[PDB]
Amino acid sequence: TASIAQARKLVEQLKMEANIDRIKVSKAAADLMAYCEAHAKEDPLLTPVPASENPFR
Template sequence: MDVSSSLQQQRIIVEQLRREAAVDRQTVSESCAAMIRYITQHEQEDYLLTGFTSQKVNPFREKSSCTWHRIA
């Protein structure tokens, strides 16, 4: 590896580190509070909590019964 490519690689790393250092950070407690707030606000839309109004709107229902045919 020559010096110019090594220098270019180091510049790329420094730029990446500068971008990472500029990222806005939140404390864990702030992030948890925001997640709890979001979950609480959207729990009525969560089918895992409320279930489906009918099986017709359930995308996970079995489409058809499983059948097998005996080949003679």
């Protein structure tokens, strides 16, 4: 009983996962690259911030 129920649940969940729409990996890479480039100038760790406005020093 438990084994068959677990198998049925796994099968149905994986079937529902199988029908999702997907986009090409190149498009995803381009989107992440564009997002990273757009916000590059607003990241204190990526570009050091002068001590004049750094709250820790």
